[PDB]
Design an enzyme around this catalytic site. Structure first.
Site, PDB file in Angstrom:
ATOM      1  N   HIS A  12       1.050  -1.071  -0.129  1.00  0.00           N
ATOM      2  CA  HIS A  12      -0.459  -0.173  -0.084  1.00  0.00           C
ATOM      3  C   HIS A  12       0.734   1.311  -0.157  1.00  0.00           C
ATOM      4  O   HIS A  12       0.670   2.326   0.006  1.00  0.00           O
ATOM      5  CB  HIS A  12      -1.184  -0.150   1.197  1.00  0.00           C
ATOM      6  CG  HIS A  12      -1.957  -1.311   1.543  1.00  0.00           C
ATOM      7  ND1 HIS A  12      -3.064  -1.608  -0.034  1.00  0.00           N
ATOM      8  CD2 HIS A  12      -1.706  -2.391   2.217  1.00  0.00           C
ATOM      9  CE1 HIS A  12      -3.740  -2.655   0.321  1.00  0.00           C
ATOM     10  NE2 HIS A  12      -3.072  -3.419   1.236  1.00  0.00           N
ATOM     11  N   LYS A  41      -3.900  -9.533  -7.697  1.00  0.00           N
ATOM     12  CA  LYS A  41      -4.692  -9.118  -6.840  1.00  0.00           C
ATOM     13  C   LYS A  41      -5.875  -8.107  -7.285  1.00  0.00           C
ATOM     14  O   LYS A  41      -5.451  -7.523  -8.144  1.00  0.00           O
ATOM     15  CB  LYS A  41      -4.258  -8.957  -5.857  1.00  0.00           C
ATOM     16  CG  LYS A  41      -4.302  -8.095  -4.817  1.00  0.00           C
ATOM     17  CD  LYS A  41      -3.470  -7.505  -3.707  1.00  0.00           C
ATOM     18  CE  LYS A  41      -4.395  -7.543  -2.241  1.00  0.00           C
ATOM     19  NZ  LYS A  41      -4.983  -6.091  -1.638  1.00  0.00           N
ATOM     20  N   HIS A 119      -4.273  -2.821   7.573  1.00  0.00           N
ATOM     21  CA  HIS A 119      -4.767  -3.332   6.411  1.00  0.00           C
ATOM     22  C   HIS A 119      -5.396  -2.166   6.148  1.00  0.00           C
ATOM     23  O   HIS A 119      -5.431  -1.280   6.707  1.00  0.00           O
ATOM     24  CB  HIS A 119      -6.193  -4.557   6.784  1.00  0.00           C
ATOM     25  CG  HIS A 119      -7.477  -4.173   6.576  1.00  0.00           C
ATOM     26  ND1 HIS A 119      -7.954  -4.925   5.264  1.00  0.00           N
ATOM     27  CD2 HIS A 119      -8.340  -3.560   6.422  1.00  0.00           C
ATOM     28  CE1 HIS A 119      -9.071  -4.363   4.850  1.00  0.00           C
ATOM     29  NE2 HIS A 119      -9.345  -3.265   6.788  1.00  0.00           N
ATOM     30  N   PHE A 120      -5.721  -2.048   4.839  1.00  0.00           N
ATOM     31  CA  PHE A 120      -6.107  -0.851   3.734  1.00  0.00           C
ATOM     32  C   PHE A 120      -7.392  -1.018   4.564  1.00  0.00           C
ATOM     33  O   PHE A 120      -7.667  -1.970   3.421  1.00  0.00           O
ATOM     34  CB  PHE A 120      -4.980  -0.481   2.314  1.00  0.00           C
ATOM     35  CG  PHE A 120      -5.918   1.030   1.478  1.00  0.00           C
ATOM     36  CD1 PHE A 120      -7.024   0.924   1.281  1.00  0.00           C
ATOM     37  CD2 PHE A 120      -5.099   2.051   1.897  1.00  0.00           C
ATOM     38  CE1 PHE A 120      -7.476   1.802   1.031  1.00  0.00           C
ATOM     39  CE2 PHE A 120      -5.673   2.953   1.490  1.00  0.00           C
ATOM     40  CZ  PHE A 120      -6.788   3.419   0.964  1.00  0.00           C
ATOM     41  N   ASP A 121      -8.582  -0.154   4.216  1.00  0.00           N
ATOM     42  CA  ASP A 121     -10.072  -0.911   4.641  1.00  0.00           C
ATOM     43  C   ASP A 121     -10.592   0.141   3.342  1.00  0.00           C
ATOM     44  O   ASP A 121     -10.804  -0.612   2.169  1.00  0.00           O
ATOM     45  CB  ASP A 121     -10.667  -0.660   5.811  1.00  0.00           C
ATOM     46  CG  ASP A 121     -12.560  -0.838   5.955  1.00  0.00           C
ATOM     47  OD1 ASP A 121     -12.694  -2.110   6.133  1.00  0.00           O
ATOM     48  OD2 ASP A 121     -12.518  -0.080   6.290  1.00  0.00           O
TER      49      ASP A 121
END
Length: 124
Positions: A12, A41, A119-121
Site C-alpha cells: 500500500h 490480486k 490493513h487498508f480497508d
C-alpha cells in the site's frame, strides 16, 4: 517473514511518488510489490504519502471497517491514491491493471504497539 505492518507498506505505500507516473504504473507496481505472485490480486490501492502521515491515521476519526470491526480510522485529511483495479484481458501470469488516480480519504485498520496500519480497508 513480513510483519503485517511492513506487508501493508509493501502492498500500500509509495511515498516516493506524488501520484501515478503514467498508466502502466499499476502494472509496474503490482508486479513490483509482489501482488501478482501466486495469483493476480483483484484490486490494490497505493498511498502516496509519507508513512509517518499515514501511520498517524490510527489517531484520526475512528470508523467501522467494512467487514464489521472497530479498529479502523479514516483520515481527517485527503490523501492521493492510485487504485489498481485488475482488468478483463488479465491472465496471470499477466495481470493487467488499470491506474485510476484520485485524491481521497483513506480508512485503514490499525494494530500493535506501536499502533500502525495493517490493513487498508477503504477510501471515500
Amino acid at each position: 517473514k513480513e510483519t503485517a505492518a511492513a506487508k501493508f507498506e509493501r502492498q500500500h505505500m509509495d511515498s516516493s511518488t506524488s501520484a501515478a507516473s503514467s498508466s502502466n504504473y499499476c502494472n509496474q507496481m503490482m508486479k513490483s510489490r509482489n501482488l501478482t505472485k501466486d495469483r493476480c490480486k483483484p484490486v490494490n490501492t497505493f498511498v502516496h504519502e509519507s508513512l509517518a502521515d499515514v501511520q498517524a491515521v490510527c489517531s484520526q476519526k475512528n470508523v467501522a471497517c467494512k467487514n464489521g470491526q472497530t479498529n479502523c480510522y479514516q483520515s481527517y485529511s485527503t490523501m492521493s491514491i492510485t487504485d489498481c483495479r485488475e482488468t478483463g484481458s488479465s491472465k496471470y501470469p499477466n495481470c493487467a491493471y488499470k491506474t485510476t488516480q484520485a485524491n481521497k480519504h483513506i480508512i485503514v485498520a490499525c494494530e500493535g504497539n506501536p499502533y500502525v496500519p495493517v490493513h487498508f480497508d477503504a477510501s471515500v
